[PDB]
């Protein structure tokens, strides 16, 4: 292993440091301007560079180790006694499914699914609402010659029926039983990559990382490898909570090890969602455009 240049001595302006790691939703970038979010982001920026220092010296030898450093950072930002600590600390296990309902703060994703060039029209058969027309984005990967289904987005299009039907269901089963159904089976939701695929994806991420810490790549090849690493890590969503932050941390740390000071993602571009809504090569090709490289 050959030492890399390490983090750039020319740093992002403080305004930009305070957007590293931000979720700049197009319908609500107010959170990115709060003092607590600016401090979280600047902390991520500094910790990324500290990890890049170590990568550049050969002190972080695997992607798993880099992800652990990102996880340690993310856990350190939780409040003392946070009940979500275990979830932010833990990989998803193969006995479980993972679901994010497309409710706030994810409402901007609804139109991205409905309007997606690669969306499909499907019929979702739900035990409470019955048959629902859905727009579906089926994210997939191809590794070692085989397809791997990743994240699946669904948005239900018969909204008048849904409002009337959900009102109905609530009284019979109790807000309790309807809420149980909606946490897992909300008509608009992301069903995430099966955790059974994490061993193979983790191995691939380790291979990408070893490639990406080589001293012989061009800047173009490095940025593509960083984009690919980000895509696989965010789309795999390895942990129960915090995967998006950890994936961005890792991608930026790898860049910083090479002296690249990547700017914040643009307003309106939430990187993990952009990854989950794209195929791999599509994402690699658009990655630079997602970053706010304007002067």
């Amino acid at each position: 292993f050959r030492a890399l240049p390490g983090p750039s001595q020319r740093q992002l302006e403080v305004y930009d440091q305070c957007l590293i790691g931000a979720a700049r939703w197009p319908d609500d970038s107010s959170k990115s301007n709060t003092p607590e979010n600016r401090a979280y982001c600047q902390s991520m920026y500094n910790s990324i560079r500290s990890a890049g220092d170590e990568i550049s010296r050969g002190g972080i030898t695997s992607f798993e180790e880099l992800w652990g450093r990102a996880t340690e950072w993310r856990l350190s930002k939780l409040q003392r006694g946070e009940p979500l600590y275990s979830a932010f600390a833990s990989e998803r296990t193969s006995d479980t499914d993972a679901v994010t309902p497309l409710v706030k703060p994810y409402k901007s994703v609804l139109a991205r699914v409905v309007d997606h060039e690669d969306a499909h029209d499907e019929i979702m058969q739900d035990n409470l609402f019955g048959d629902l027309n859905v727009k579906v984005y089926r994210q997939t990967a191809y590794l070692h010659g085989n397809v791997i289904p990743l994240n699946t987005f669904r948005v239900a299009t018969d909204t008048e029926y849904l409002r009337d039907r959900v009102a109905h269901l609530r009284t019979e089963l109790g807000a309790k039983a309807l809420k149980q159904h909606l946490q897992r089976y909300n008509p608009d939701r992301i069903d995430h990559t099966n955790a059974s695929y994490l061993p193979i994806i983790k191995d691939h991420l380790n291979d990408l990382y070893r490639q990406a810490i080589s001293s012989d790549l061009s800047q173009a090849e490095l940025i593509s490898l960083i984009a690919r690493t980000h895509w696989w890590a965010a789309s795999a969503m390895p942990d129960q909570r915090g995967s998006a932050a950890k994936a961005e941390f890792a991608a930026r740390a790898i860049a910083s090890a090479h002296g690249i000071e990547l700017p914040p993602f643009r307003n309106g571009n939430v990187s993990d969602i952009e990854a989950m809504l794209s195929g791999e090569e599509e994402f690699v090709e658009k990655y630079r455009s997602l970053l706010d490289s304007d002067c």
Binding site: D95, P101, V166, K179, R184, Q240, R241
Partner: peptide, 25 residues
């Protein structure tokens, strides 16, 4: 008709907006 997602108004059973984990069926 309501916008997408806007069928879920004033519902005490609305889902919370983050990733949840469940045992496989």
């Amino acid at each position: 008709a309501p916008k997408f997602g806007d069928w879920d108004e004033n519902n005490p059973s609305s889902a919370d907006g983050y990733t949840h984990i469940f045992n496989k069926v």
